[PDB]
Amino acid sequence: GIRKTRETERLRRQLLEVFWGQDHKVDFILQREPYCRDINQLSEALLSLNF
């Protein structure tokens, strides 16, 4: 269920490559869905934020 440190970090680095310079937003999305392992669901959740 809950992600491992290496899984979270791999997902973080991948999300940061797409959403450059959005470190706080990438982490905010990773903390809101800590069980999610899908890069595409995590990317669509980030894109839903109007800020």
């Binding site: 706080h24 903390q31 809101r32 934020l49 800020f51």
Partner: protein, 213 residues
């Protein structure tokens, strides 16, 4: 949409990633909202989440979420469960601590969802609780009665010569002689020895001044 909980938690998150306080101008560089849009969110969320000061507008993050003070807690209990000493950079702890070191455990995640705070990491939550939860402050001197009286107390005194009600946000009495000033030289020394730097104490002071109104 100034009332959205997602945008409020994201502001709390940025403020706590930068020490619990930021100038409005510096906060704007990190969130895609115009100045009036950000101002509307801060205003409608109010002083229970954001304390705004005209120092040059400055913003201090706060919360009503509290940590459980029980030495042994028997569930149910709807507070956060975490090691207090660990957050102050002073837990000696194989880990034989009887208090949770997993800041974002399943139990704590649920409490964070109730306070609309899911999205904060363990470092940002520590900064937030340190300036909002009075459980993180050092002990108050019980023999301290007020200013210009009793030679301070019976005693340097290792405890705070501050109003207890002021720190807990409930000093609703007009005849209070006890100090509400945390930026005093002696208070800062006691706060520092217990893990609270003067920037954190100034955040606490502003939050407590906000509760006093």
């Amino acid at each position: 949409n100034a009332a959205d909980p997602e945008v409020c938690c994201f502001i709390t998150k940025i403020l706590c990633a930068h020490g619990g306080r930021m100038a409005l101008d510096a906060l704007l560089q990190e969130i895609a909202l115009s100045e009036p849009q950000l101002c509307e969110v801060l205003q409608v969320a109010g002083p229970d989440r954001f304390v705004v000061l005209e120092t040059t507008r400055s913003v201090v993050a706060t919360t009503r979420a509290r940590v459980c003070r029980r030495k042994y807690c028997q569930r149910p209990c709807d507070n956060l469960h975490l090691c207090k000493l660990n957050l102050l950079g002073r837990c000696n702890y194989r880990n034989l601590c009887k208090y949770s070191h997993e800041v974002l455990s399943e139990e704590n995640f649920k409490v964070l969802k109730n306070h609309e705070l899911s999205g904060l990491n363990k470092e940002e939550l520590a900064v937030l609780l340190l300036q909002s939860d009075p459980f993180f402050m050092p002990e108050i001197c019980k023999s301290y009665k007020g200013e210009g009286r009793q030679q301070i107390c019976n005693q340097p005194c290792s405890r705070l010569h501050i109003c207890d009600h002021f720190t807990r946000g409930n000093c609703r009495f007009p005849n209070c002689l006890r100090s509400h000033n945390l930026m005093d030289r002696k208070v800062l020394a006691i706060m520092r020895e217990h893990g609270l730097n003067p920037d954190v104490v100034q955040n606490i002071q502003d939050i407590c001044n906000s509760k006093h109104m």
